[PDB]
Write a protein that binds this ligand. Structure first.
Ligand code: DOL
Ligand code: DOL
Ligand code: MG
Ligand code: MG
Ligand code: MG
Ligand code: MG
Lengths: 7, 293, 293, 7
């Protein structure tokens, strides 16, 4: 949920 | 102690993600759903910068030395730029689908950025020449990028479990994080001149010196899932805890305090510091500020 | 035209930054890493002056009228002095850490200097009384300082985008540079009696008269990032181009010529002129001289 | 890189 999966 | 106030945005589409402040208290946010960049004036007024083409997925941004807002377009394979005159320039990358993400200024003024699918550090000049440097290892998934006290650029390698170092001549050097498959994300220069970073998986705040010495400090809340880290006053290091819905602070003696945001499921992302106020972006349509008093 | 010779130092630790010549061809350099001041004798031998305490960050220096080398200690909050008997005197500033930088001689012999964090022009006498004058604007970040034809001291205001003027009575006067946020650095008295200066961001050579009239000349190389400026022969004005790795020269008709160094990434800093040779310090462990052929 | 950031 932090943009790139999973940042 | 401190105090937590959340500013609600009027655009509700938008997805506030990367945040930065300027040579006044002008805060700039990237909004990856709205496909635009907004600025909140010192006292009140928002001004949005709608991108020409849709689906760019605006991620990280930074304010350059010559008064420009630089940003990456994760899905458009582009580097963006808002000039002092308010116009938007976009620069396409050499290779298709490089997926630019992190962005910061280099010691000479050049803008450096990371390419996740591209697996290479980037480099761009105002007049818009680009040169890249391939990483040694396959699928390092480079993310955030920061300028260290040794004037080399320091970057986290999400998949490769490392902190990378790149100097001006493209010489790349990697330091393997003791915590296996910790998946580092945020990196920033601390006021002690070491590079501080977060471990989304390991659940740790990491410190790496310019020499390469690594020390780790465990985040009290389990599964906190930290995203972005910024330096505050003195030795302070603030970080957004995306999974725990909290704001973490590494204070004196390397102790971690955690301040609950607790409007629920807010998704804290990018974070910075203007000198008095810790500013952080929450993907769920609001902007958080945190002052001591 | 001209010719470019770089002398390599034997101390490698060192970081040569500020340079000056004497009433012989004696060149003195500040070395901020070595924490010392060296002198290169007319033909051959260096003589180092090691500071008593470590971490002073020796920046600018100048040779006073009575045969003394005066210098600032950026990180030690001090003003330094080498007497003609070779002994080092150090003078602590009234306010903790004030961060002194630029330095030049006043019309009466007094030594004037700028305090960056301090935000005030300084003043020191041989017997070591100090008096300061607070700047009007918050965080002007004053840098270089030079003595103008009107016998007032002229200084650049890096943050405040201005050229400042201070007379003997502490009367301060400021002139806003047309180029917004240009971040001026080097200032010097030109042989036409106007004050000439560099714009690290604007990428321009600036000229201000004593009356206050400003004219600007664009540097041909983009992002040149100029640091220090000195007056040469006739109307010549030489300047170190830190970011472009070149030496710039404003000649006849206000034309800028640019001579490449071509030792890569050398970091040219301080610059001066002994009558025949343009001397300039390169932070990357060498000293550059440039003569007409 | 010019001593004080960024002179
Ligand atoms: C064109 C871009 N510019 C200029 C416009 C910037 C590159 S640079 O100027 O920032 C740079 C950073 C530090 N470098 C040093 O020599 C240095 C950094 O810390 C120190 N020296 C301190 C020391 O005390 C010296 C000692 O430790 C020496 C070390 C660690 C030397 C390391 C090896 N240095 C190099 O090989 C230089 C490598 C690259 C080219 C660096 C940098 C650019 C990062 O060299 C420098 O120009 C400079
Ligand atoms: C830390 C995250 N966790 C775990 C702790 C929670 C689950 S989530 O947060 O990741 C979730 C996924 C997408 N959500 C959006 O808001 C979202 C997704 O697409 C969009 N918004 C885009 C849109 O704006 C429009 C879209 O068509 C429909 C929307 C936005 C509907 C929004 C209404 N959502 C809710 O009522 C609830 C939103 C939160 C509660 C949701 C949960 C209901 C799953 O989770 C979100 O935070 C997140
Ligand atoms: Mg999300
Ligand atoms: Mg620019
Ligand atoms: Mg004297
Ligand atoms: Mg330097």
């Amino acid at each position: 949920x932090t943009x790139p999966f999973x940042x | 102690e401190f105090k937590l106030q959340e500013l609600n945005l009027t655009n509700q589409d938008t997805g506030p993600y990367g945040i930065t402040v300027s040579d006044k208290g002008k805060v700039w946010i990237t909004q990856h759903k709205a496909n635009m960049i907004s600025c909140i004036n010192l006292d009140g007024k928002i001004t949005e910068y709608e991108l020409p083409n849709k689906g760019a997925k605006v991620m990280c941004l930074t304010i350059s030395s010559d008064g420009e807002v630089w940003f990456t377009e994760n899905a458009a394979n582009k580097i963006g730029r808002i000039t002092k005159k308010g116009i938007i320039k976009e620069y396409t990358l050499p290779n298709p689908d490089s997926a630019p993400y992190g962005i910061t200024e280099g010691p000479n003024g050049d803008i450096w950025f990371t390419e996740m699918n591209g697996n290479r550090i980037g480099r761009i000049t105002d007049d818009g020449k680009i040169r890249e440097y391939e990483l040694p290892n396959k699928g390092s998934y480079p993310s955030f990028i920061t300028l260290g006290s040794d004037n080399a650029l320091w970057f986290t390698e999400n998949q490769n479990n490392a902190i990378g170092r790149i100097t001006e001549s493209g010489d790349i050097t990697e330091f393997k994080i003791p915590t296996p498959a910790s998946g580092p994300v945020g990196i920033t220069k601390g006021n002690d001149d070491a590079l501080w970073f977060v471990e989304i998986i390991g659940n740790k705040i990491g410190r790496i010196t310019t020499s390469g010495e690594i020390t780790e400090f465990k985040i009290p809340t389990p599964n906190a899932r930290p995203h972005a880290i910024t330096a505050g006053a003195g030795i302070d290091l603030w970080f957004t805890e995306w999974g725990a819905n909290k704001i973490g602070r590494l204070t004196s003696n390397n102790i971690i305090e955690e301040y609950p945001i607790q409007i629920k499921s807010a998704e804290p992302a990018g974070i910075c510091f203007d000198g008095e106020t810790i500013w952080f972006a929450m993907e769920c349509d609001k902007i958080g500020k945190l002052t001591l008093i």
